[model samples]
Target: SAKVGEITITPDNSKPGRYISSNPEYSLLAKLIDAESIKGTEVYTFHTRKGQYVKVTVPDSNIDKMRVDYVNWKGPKYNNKLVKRFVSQFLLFRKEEKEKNEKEALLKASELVSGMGDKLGEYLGVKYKNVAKEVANDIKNFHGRNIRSYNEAMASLNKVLANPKMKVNKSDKDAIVNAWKQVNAKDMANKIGNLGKAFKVADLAIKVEKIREKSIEGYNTGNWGPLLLEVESWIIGGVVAGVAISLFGAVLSFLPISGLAVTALGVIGIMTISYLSSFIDANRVSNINNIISSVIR
Candidate 1:
């Protein structure tokens, strides 16, 4: 499969007129129970809610897109029992929801260090405006079939975080560690993002550009609302809920962490965990912080 992601369809609440995931990427609310493409692109079928069968078509493979037979939904002789047009609209909203997720992802990644509020641009080797773009790509690769949850997500990303070009230090270490020390997964899932119960694992990317004029010369913090961002899917527990990203006077109150802190953290391993599904197990992860905090030449 091309892997944009599987869309889950469910009965709508506010609309009550459509069946959809309130937000895509994270929430399994209106989530399509299960999805897999058919051999023939022109003909395909899937269950709307795990058990509700629905037929769909995408004859225009030349353009690389799929559309449901909304044509059969409401006008006449139409059963209207099939809600594919509703699914179509649900997907369109998902198209833009996660554009914020990467931005959202950037902030969460920042908590991994100290100078993140402002220096994250140089730290990640990309412009602030494009941080989410790189994050989204990493997320796609992390979500590939061979890989699955947050622990594995970070495991694969450990090398990337350990890149020689990465910036890490004492204040960065404290910011990353202490910030995590205070974090509790359930509390986080409760305090972040635009969509509460509906936020999907991929929805971690959905925050706006407010790299505020605050402070980041030291440690970081967070809040919740199930920005339910599944990190194995990206960086989750939606690490940056209303992430307080503000710039300071740039005095650089850095402390030299050197290699000792790395050794200490390595010996004292820790990984924040939630949702004990097939993907993540708190006991299995011992070094997520070490990977994010890794400092290599």
Candidate 2:
């Protein structure tokens, strides 16, 4: 009926709580199953109740956003037995936890980047502040679905970065524009397209760790050249996660991705990218170096 994402609900710690945690963008219950927390466990699946799954439909119609129903073990856990059973059953969780965190973290990163602009304004003045905001928007829009394909989005982002009207220091624009070239949208899409397969949860952690190392390198050297682009990677990861969450079922191989699925993915992708871009832009101006440090987790 609609694009669906499949996620498992599991218990927190070894203890059985009245309410086990399901991925809701953020929560301790969710974190316990992330790539970093897997500890080499095979993460084999069990039928929570009848084949081990509940469908959270991602509707094509924009009117209704993603909706989740949480279940409780107390016989009255928000009225969804399928969900309740999923949680109450022995803990069987999955990697979507990492995806959800990326979705949320990207939003936070966007805001932080935008904040950096504001901070610069506080120190420098409104002129730089406004420019910084523009810069952050450029990153958000690049990851956003406004442009149909990866190639188009890249061109569009670089166009804005290279625009004389952007008003950033020549050196900053040069570094950002050059850095954007290093991004391979198609490669990223293909990688994400194979989410549960070759690109496992642990792989996702590796990428984030690499980004962290890059940031640390830049910070130590006082060469903030790559920091901006690093933030963009977060936004991209966020957008990808959004799409994965929304198209969980179809993407997992039930059916080939249809035009409708593309559109649905686009909607979620744009929304998360927008949030992340805003977060990064805002906090970036405050203190980019520190921003990276705080957001690395």
Candidate 3:
């Protein structure tokens, strides 16, 4: 199953060798057996995508596993940083019973913050996308904080139909409402008056793409200008003994600028966990239309 890209992988469990193949797409994942998996044996058992798992034997052998011939995909593959999400995985923080207590407490305290993603997204205008994305990022960023209930969760996240700081002034609202009044639109398209909002979305999209591309290819560096958003290495990937990452298991961690750093579109942080998509892509763009539709009426 290809979740990230067109990279589809199927493990043929019906026969010998228990073959795994993308056959075509190169990101195909394969896992060797328990013993070969456990030994300092280099049989590349680290290919852990949270996808469907199967158990099979990889002959116990001692060879240079890093050569990476398809037949020799033996230490696993290799991303970064320090965050509770990744760092917490290492130290056993609190006992299992205490952990259960804290989990329930986190969930209970997140009560106000939890359901508000959709609530905020309910507004429309070109800014609808911005608002939705902003609130979600805030929640994800604050996820590390030990909060209890509806306090400072963005005073927060704006008010329903009330003019807040970045309120949808008449021009932006009129432009978007008129565009959709004619027909359903996927993006802000050519709506006038909300160009400011459109710029924000466009900027965030560019940043999201940058993070995904470099994170996938691994990292190095470049330079900056036009206010280059001061991004440090956004290292992300998994590093558990037997656990491998798929989708965002490739995740590893982030600290974001609250001011003009990313302007107003910082992600929830690398070290945090949630379904934050780096690329806002097509699926979410559609939701913009729906959110606008609800807001105008």
- Candidate 2 global lDDT: 0.34
* lDDT for 109 (candidate 3): 23
Identify the runs in model 1 with alpha carbons over 4 angstroms from their true place: 1-88, 111-184, 191-297
Count clashing residue pairs per candidate.
34, 35, 12
Residue runs of model 2 more than 4 Å from their true location after superposition: 1-8, 11-44, 47-103, 122-124, 134-148, 160-205, 209-297
Assess candidate 1 and give its lDDT: 0.30
Best by TM-score: 2
Q: Which stretches of candidate 3 lie over 4 Å from their true place?
A: 1-253, 266-282, 288-297
Cα lDDT for residue 30, model 3? 35
Instruction: Rank by lDDT, highest first.
Output: 2, 1, 3
Q: Which of the two candidates, 1 or 3, achieves a greater lDDT against the reference?
A: 1
Which is the leading candidate under lDDT? 2
| lDDT of candidate 1 at residue 87, scale 0 to 100 | 37
TM-score of 2: 0.31
List the RMSD of every prediction in angstroms: 14.3, 17.2, 20.1
Q: For model 1, how big is the CA root-mean-square deviation? A: 14.3
